[PDB]
């Protein structure tokens, strides 16, 4: 309800963060992952992404 | 710089050097006689309209003509 404490973040970076580390750089938004690429590399084997070729 | 209109001296020339050689083309006309290309093409159209040259093939990029017989 407080004024003077927010600026419009409804588009672009800042409005979107990584859902594991609240980071704004290097997001993956394909298929609605909303995770950074490094975390994605860590949790891909548990999500279900397996490299084949 | 070339001649792009016919002053009737190029006209009666090309009428009198149509038998002189065999292979008629745009570049042949340009090199034998100083015509700036477009009139050479128009002259090819006029000569195939009344053919004392006959066509071998008529592609756009190049037209190949020789003498009537």
């Amino acid at each position: 309800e407080n004024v003077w404490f927010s600026h419009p973040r409804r588009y672009g970076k800042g409005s979107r963060q990584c859902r594991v580390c609240s980071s704004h750089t290097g997001l993956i938004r394909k298929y609605g992952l909303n995770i950074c690429r490094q975390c994605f590399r860590e949790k891909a084997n548990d999500i279900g992404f397996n490299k084949f070729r | 710089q070339h001649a792009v209109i016919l002053d009737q001296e190029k006209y009666d020339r090309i009428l009198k050097e149509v038998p002189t050689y065999r292979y008629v083309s745009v570049s042949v006309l340009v090199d034998r006689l100083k015509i700036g290309g477009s009139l050479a093409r128009i002259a090819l159209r006029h000569l195939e309209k009344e053919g004392i040259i006959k066509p071998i093939s008529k592609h756009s990029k190049q037209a190949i003509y020789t003498r009537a017989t």
Partner: protein, 112 residues
């Protein structure tokens, strides 16, 4: 190529494939020159040419001559290739192909 062989037929009544064969035969470079280490001036020694390399260098010379003689001209690629093929069929010291052949032969007979 179809336009070129048509121009070949218009210029001369003989077979255009025979013209191509005669051109390749008359511009195959009989004697090339290879490289030798040769401490100092890093020498070159004359060496004969296998027939496939003859044919390949012949076709390459013909097409490079047509390219450079019809880069910026009124004359088209078909006309330039046809006149080069005619002069290579009758070697008249006018084809770029036979000029490169002749310089290859003279540098080979000098460097042997």
């Amino acid at each position: 190529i179809k336009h070129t062989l048509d121009i070949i037929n218009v210029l001369t009544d003989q077979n255009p494939i025979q013209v191509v064969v005669d051109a390749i035969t008359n511009t195959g470079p009989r004697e090339d020159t290879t490289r030798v280490g040769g401490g100092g001036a890093a020498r070159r020694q004359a060496v004969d040419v296998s027939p496939l390399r003859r044919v390949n260098q012949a076709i390459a010379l013909l097409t490079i001559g047509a390219r450079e003689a019809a880069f910026r001209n009124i004359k088209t690629i078909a006309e330039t290739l046809a006149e080069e093929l005619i002069n290579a069929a009758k070697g008249s010291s006018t084809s770029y192909a036979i000029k490169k052949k002749d310089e290859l032969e003279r540098v080979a007979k000098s460097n042997r």
